[PDB]
A paper describes a structure:
Rspo (R-spondin, also roof plate-specific spondin) proteins are evolutionarily conserved from fish to humans and have well-documented roles in a broad range of developmental and physiological processes resulting from enhancement of canonical and non-canonical Wnt signalling. ZNRF3/RNF43 specifically targets these Wnt receptors for ubiquitination and turnover, hence reducing Wnt signalling responses. Direct extracellular interaction with Rspo proteins inhibits ZNRF3/RNF43 activity.
By using a combination of heavy atom and molecular-replacement-based phasing strategies, we determined multiple crystal structures for Xenopus (x) Rspo2Fu1–Fu2 (highest resolution 2.2 Å), xZNRF3ecto, zebrafish (z) ZNRF3ecto and mouse (m) ZNRF3ecto, (highest resolutions 2.4, 1.6 and 2.0 Å, respectively), plus complexes comprising xZNRF3ecto–xRspo2Fu1–Fu2, mZNRF3ecto–mRspo2Fu1–Fu2, mZNRF3ecto–xRspo2Fu1–Fu2 and xRNF4F3ecto–xRspo2Fu1–Fu2 (at 2.1, 2.8, 2.4 and 2.7 Å, respectively). Neither the Rspo2Fu1–Fu2 nor the ZNRF3ecto dimer show major conformational changes on complex formation. The first, extensive, area of interaction involves hydrophobic interactions interspersed with hydrophilic (complementarily charged) patches contributed by the first two β-hairpins of the Rspo Fu1 and the region immediately carboxy-terminal to the β3 strand of ZNRF3ecto. The Met-finger at the tip of the second β-hairpin of Fu1 nestles into a pocket formed between the β3 strand and the αC–β7 loop of the ZNRF3ecto, which is lined with hydrophobic residues (I95, I191, V192, A198). The αC–β7 loop is a flexible region in the unliganded ZNRF3ecto crystal structures and moulds to interface the RspoFu1–Fu2 M68 in the complex. The acidic region of the β3–β4 loop (immediately adjacent to C104 of the disulphide bridge) becomes more ordered in the ligand-bound ZNRF3ecto structures, probably as a result of electrostatic interactions with a positively charged patch on Rspo Fu1. For all ZNRF3ecto–Rspo2Fu1–Fu2 complex structures we determined (from five different combinations of species and crystal forms), the dimer found in most of the unliganded ZNRF3ecto crystal structures reoccurs.
Residue numbers in the entry:
A (entry chain B): 39 to 143
B (entry chain A), C (entry chain C): 22 to 182
D (entry chain D): 39 to 145
Write the structure that this text describes.
């Protein structure tokens, strides 16, 4: 049944979440329904909007976990993190800090 | 002083459930529903696979969205107005956004938000080129039952001239 | 004795090419073409993704044929009749077989086989419930060029009396 | 272009093949056009019919290579063949011959 929502609908799932939680839109074939989660699922990051908290799909190139739309926190293996984006090699101007995968100056 | 508006034309919506059968053929079963064409969109026939959209997901705010195949018929079940106290978009806005995301047409179930009908029909904004249909009562119940329970379905929205 | 035949109604066929943005939005670009509704099928609007079918592939034979998503618009270019000396099916039969296999409409390019029109409009067999449209000339050349060169396209077949 | 066809069109490719070759229908996006091959592609078997030689798709469960619609020549690795069909284990009353994937009566 309707875990985490203050209001729920048989057709649309959750409409508002208890205020801790994140609103996630689950796609199941033709259906799209709302769920309220403690944390966003893999591949998704959370956004605390003015109205509600919600999950959105990470689409940063060569990222394994997004903070926000344009800021990757964990790049995928072999790419260096540079100002929220993931590169095969650091860009000129920066090198990796010692044994790690962060570009620095 | 203005008089009553012309009635909105009937949208004869055939919902098709389909099943592949022994050879590669399809066995189909049709449900006939009726709504109305709103002033928010053109009064024309349209057809496409049915895709439910949660009303709260139709926003400009959330930006990169998943790519759906072009030409789907959006089904949006509207909730009681107070459930969305400051909408990201008006009902016309949401219909537009669905068309931007590749909708060939949009059907609103307005059973829980009768006021949406006045909004769709205001006719102050310039209409979409695709049909924006509203449905309620048993028609809407039957539509949502199919969406909730079937694996897939195709809507054929017919303007019967 | 019987007189001339009522002229067949015009099928207005919008061919829609679309493009997606990174954000998940689509732009569309439409070419409007014209053909006619044959008696082999209904005179109604239909819409779906365009799928070319080689005439030789529409048989009862080759039994294990592949599976396309329900609701496609078949485009069949007919060749000179001497190019298939013993057809597996008549032109009506081929239209029926496309509908069995999920087609929402069939458009025949009859430029190289104008006698196909007469066969389509005979009205002896039970007509299909989907439109069976025929096109030729400029319009057919344009359809077949889009099929041959572009990646995907959607057809919108409109009946406007 | 029109390779191997007796007749050919821009929009349909081959309409008729040179008599030895097999007719195969290639799907490329919206297109479907005729090709005329010496042998049918992987996944397909050839049928020499009354009018024409065609390629048809192998749909036999767990088969890597069909002879006909109903008869498999090469089962997927790890499957046993019996009467043109492919099984994870030989059906009741049959056993693999020696160290092969062919079912014969016994054990």
């Amino acid at each position: 049944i309707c875990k985490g929502c203050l209001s729920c609908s048989k057709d649309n799932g959750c409409l508002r979440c208890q205020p801790k939680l994140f609103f996630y839109l689950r796609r199941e074939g033709m259906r799209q329904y709302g769920e309220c989660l403690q944390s966003c699922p893999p591949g998704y990051y959370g956004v605390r909007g003015p109205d509600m908290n919600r999950c959105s799909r990470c689409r940063i190139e060569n990222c394994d976990s997004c903070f926000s739309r344009d800021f990757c926190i964990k790049c995928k293996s072999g790419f260096y993190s540079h100002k929220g984006q993931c590169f095969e090699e650091c860009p000129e101007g920066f090198a990796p800090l010692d044994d790690t995968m962060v570009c620095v100056d | 002083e203005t008089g009553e508006s012309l009635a909105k034309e009937t949208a004869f919506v055939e919902v098709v459930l389909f099943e592949s059968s022994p050879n590669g053929d399809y066995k189909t079963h049709t449900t006939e529903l009726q709504g109305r064409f709103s002033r928010a969109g053109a009064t024309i026939s349209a057809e496409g696979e049915i895709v439910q959209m949660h009303p709260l997901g139709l926003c400009n705010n959330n930006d990169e969205e998943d790519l759906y195949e072009y030409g789907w018929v959006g089904v949006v079940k509207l909730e009681q107005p107070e459930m969305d106290p400051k909408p990201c978009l008006t009902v016309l806005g949401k219909a537009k956004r669905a068309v931007q995301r590749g909708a060939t047409a949009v059907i609103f179930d307005v059973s829980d938000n009768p006021d949406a009908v006045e909004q769709l029909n205001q006719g102050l904004e310039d209409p979409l080129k695709r049909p924006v249909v509203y449905m309620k009562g048993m028609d809407a119940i039957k539509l949502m039952n199919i969406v909730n329970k079937q694996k897939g379905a195709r809507a054929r929205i017919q303007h019967r001239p």
